[PDB]
Amino acid sequence: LTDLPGVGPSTAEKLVEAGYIDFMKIATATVGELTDIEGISEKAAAKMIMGARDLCDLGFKSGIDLLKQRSTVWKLSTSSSELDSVLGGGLESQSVTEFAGVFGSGKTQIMHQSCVNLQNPEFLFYDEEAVSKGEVAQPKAVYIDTEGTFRPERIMQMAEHAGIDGQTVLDNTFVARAYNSDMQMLFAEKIEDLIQEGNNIKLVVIDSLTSTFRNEYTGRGKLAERQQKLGRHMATLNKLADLFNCVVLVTNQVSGHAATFRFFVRKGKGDKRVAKLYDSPHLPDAEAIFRITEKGIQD
Ligand SMILES: Nc1ncnc2c1ncn2[C@@H]1O[C@H](COP(=O)(O)OP(=O)(O)O)[C@@H](O)[C@H]1O
Ligand SMILES: [K+]
Ligand SMILES: [Mg+2]
Ligand SMILES: [Mg+2]
16 A cells, blocks of 8 residues: 555545555545545545556557457356357356346346355356456355345256365355345445455355335335435445446346446246346447256256
């Protein structure tokens, strides 16, 4: 931290204590967040912010540097060939992907499968030139369970069928049971702490994203307040995805969100499932057919 312009030993101590230990967090911080630290003037705040941005080279970029930036994005396999393809490779880090659908369509299944695949190193697709092995080593997932449907037995089962130790997935997956939107949101904000503690969080799951908000703000005469809270939550999720080069997945029960990728999943004939990608910044709307078996997501 003392590398930052104006930052001396005492200021560094105040920053680390306030949770600002990383440069990108300071570079992307507002003078407000830092002046709130007290002891941190708006003067020092502005200088260290400018210096962090510069140290992180956050200016204008063009040409080949645009490709290099896009290359820091790694993708997580869904275990479904059709789905991975419709995704343009797999689930993207640095973005929030939403899986919406009626009850029983398979949203929770995809969340579980994703926690398992994170542990199969060959399921993380990346350009070693832009993403080092160290960056994706010992990856851990965070599962914010809003419904109480997290099933450790299901994790074990999927893991085993994929040839991976079930307990190893459990050992590297943090589950947080949230009973309301307040807990749901705090948990997500506290993910930054798991990382500061040495945990390489590479996958964040929110299952589900909207249940709590809907039960708390049913009155469609306050839907604005709800939308406001949900908006702040989503913003926290997108920033988390970006700053920590992390894959973020959310589910939504249906009978629009700030998610960069949005799917509609419906149950097909028996085993079959159809995921329709209807929203993304660079992919065409397309459907992927797959199935859910005792092995998890397959085909
Ligand atoms: N162990 C299993 N073996 C085969 N299919 C399973 C297994 N566990 C769950 N499923 C399938 O997952 C479906 C439920 O998926 P789920 O993700 O919970 O739906 P939702 O979108 O409401 O969260 C079941 O109804 C069942 O067909
Ligand atoms: K300094
Ligand atoms: Mg992003
Ligand atoms: Mg579910």
